[PDB]
């Protein structure tokens, strides 16, 4: 099986878009080529970096499907058809912060949603996950479309350290794709009751 995955990311370091692909081994003389649904060119060849392949470009039409092919000289080993606009990986949120509010007896969780400042995919659904840092527990998840939420004190054990993190996924009637990477985990402590 020479199966592979790809995801796109819109407006990474400017107006340019990022395409990333990688194999599910050895990259012996193997190259990735994308053809179709580009603005000024017929095809592009991705740039190899360690175990992954990527291209940063302004050439994506974001309309229609492309053929992504693993090639050796000119032989197609495997080709898959996919639309750049349907494999969009969201950017992870940042500046995750937790503040204990004694008067409200709760924890205020905040983070920044980078898509808000972007042009094409501005709206994502967020997934905040938290659990005690020590021991085995099922993560509690909270689904949001906004960038603050609260956790009631009573919902948590007292005098314990919690781990918390957040991720995002596209929420758009045209752009579709994948969960972002998790943000870095923050930790916070609950006081005595």
């Amino acid at each position: 099986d020479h199966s592979f995955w790809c995801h796109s990311q819109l407006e990474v370091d400017g107006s340019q878009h990022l395409l990333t692909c990688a194999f599910n081994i050895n990259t012996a003389n193997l190259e990735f080529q994308i053809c179709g649904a580009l603005l000024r060119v017929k095809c592009l060849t991705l740039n190899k970096l360690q175990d992954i392949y990527f291209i940063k470009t302004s050439e994506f039409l974001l309309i229609g499907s492309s053929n992504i092919c693993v090639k050796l000289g000119q032989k197609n080993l495997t080709c898959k058809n996919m639309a750049i606009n349907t494999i969009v990986k969201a950017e992870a949120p940042s500046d995750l912060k937790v503040v204990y509010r004694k008067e409200a007896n709760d924890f205020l969780v905040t983070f920044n949603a980078p898509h808000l400042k972007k042009k094409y995919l501005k709206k994502v659904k967020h997934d905040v996950a938290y659990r005690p840092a020590r021991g085995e527990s099922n993560w509690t998840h909270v689904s949001l479309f906004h960038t603050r939420t609260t956790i009631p004190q009573r919902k948590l054990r007292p005098k314990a350290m919690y781990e918390i993190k957040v991720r995002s996924i596209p929420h758009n009637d045209y752009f579709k794709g994948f969960w972002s990477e998790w943000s870095p985990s923050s930790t916070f402590e609950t006081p005595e009751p």
Partner: protein
């Protein structure tokens, strides 16, 4: 253009071409000349303004918003001041497209 998939074209416009158009205009605005009262009729005008070059802005059909417009129609239909002026005209026909039955 009466047989075009207007729903698909709308999604491409709303999520891409619109942003491309407003991005190029950068707040600049003018006045329109002609309007339209139906989606097929609006698409016809939009296509004409977008993909036919005009004196003073020959590169218009090669702009990103224009190429994307061309691809959307294909897929779903069976002097800097001059460039900006035309872009404003095109944008306002889209508004008419969006508001028309």
């Amino acid at each position: 253009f009466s047989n075009c998939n207007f729903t698909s074209i709308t999604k491409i416009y709303c999520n891409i071409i619109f942003h491309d158009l407003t991005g190029d205009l950068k707040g600049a605005k003018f006045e329109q000349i002609e309007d339209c009262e139906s989606k097929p009729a609006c698409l016809l005008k939009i296509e004409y303004y977008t993909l036919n070059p005009i004196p003073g802005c020959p590169s218009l059909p090669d702009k990103t918003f224009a190429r994307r417009t061309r691809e959307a129609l294909n897929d779903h239909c069976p002097v800097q001041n001059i460039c900006l002026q035309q872009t404003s005209q095109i944008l306002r026909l889209w508004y008419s497209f969006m508001q028309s039955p």
